[PDB]
């Protein structure tokens, strides 16, 4: 792709280009003055070239993923992350998340999952006409949300088929979710690559603009810190780690930062999201008890879920992608309790941090999400 920022003085140029080129070659985001072109031929480049300098176009990066009651004691080996953050709260009794809408910008969601029939699911697909959650990631994220804040509404923004997506679709989905009036945007996806530095400056600015657009509309964005076991504050991971993003790392069952989790001063908060266990680095084996139970598409087979004797629709997983929705659900719980005593997003955000508990990693001090 080649991407440009378009000034308000140049909007007629984009109109003329959109009229000339096939719609599937042009993605224009009015709200942030961004256009991105793909699959161009020589004729298309020549036409664009009479308004912009094609050689100055920047490349936006690709990104990657980062009745049964999970809270039942049948799953005590695997539901430990939820018990840690909920303590004794019964999310169903408290109707947590009622009338709050979370955008899941992810791989889609299994609309047939038996536990996702009460979330007023709304689906949008940016990539194809396949209505499935093709590889299961968005459904895993939705399961974390639904376990903690079961009464939320879910808007799914499917921005990837398989495991590699184009960031233009993530940017579009953030703006579309804002325009859809969601309350919280969850992004359990990220890019972190030795980008060419000018492409990276461009991409960081594009994300600053979409994040600011959401925040100005009083919407909080929660994003994964990533799973590279890196300090993302030493120079960019995108969007987790950027200004104005609530960036979520993962802790493992011992309470320490998980072996894969990114960390650093631009990671806002952590949530328990499990992992393979301490013996994995030695034997290559996964300790299922160190993993986290969540949903999985009924259209797929989970090997660890089957080995744990789960019904279809459930898996054992890990990742900052699972800690992120714990925070989105925490925010939704704060918001659902403030219907008649309205708090704005700034105050909700500060409440999230006040409610978190501090921990020391095996040696800095960090915050871990708690539901109240």
Residue numbers in the entry: 30 to 95, 103 to 271, 274 to 400, 403 to 412
Sentences from the paper on this structure:
To afford a high-resolution structure, full-length CylA (residues Leu27-Lys412, lacking the N-terminal secretion signal sequence) with an N-terminal polyhistidine tag was expressed in E. coli, refolded from the insoluble fraction and incubated in situ to allow for autoproteolytic processing. The cleaved domains co-eluted as a single species suggesting that the pro-domain was tightly bound to the protease domain. An X-ray structure of CylA non-covalently bound to its pro-domain provided a high-resolution glimpse into substrate-enzyme interactions. The side chain of Glu95 at the −1 position is within hydrogen bonding distance of the side chains of Ser260, His275 and the backbone amide of Gly262. The C-terminal carboxylate of the pro-domain is in close proximity of the hydroxy side chain of the catalytic nucleophile Ser 359. Notably, the −4 residue (Phe92) is directed into the catalytic domain where it is engaged in van der Waals contacts with residues in a pocket composed of Val195, Met196, Met206, and Leu225.
The enterococcal cytolysin is a two-component lanthipeptide secreted by Enterococcus faecalis that functions as a virulence factor.
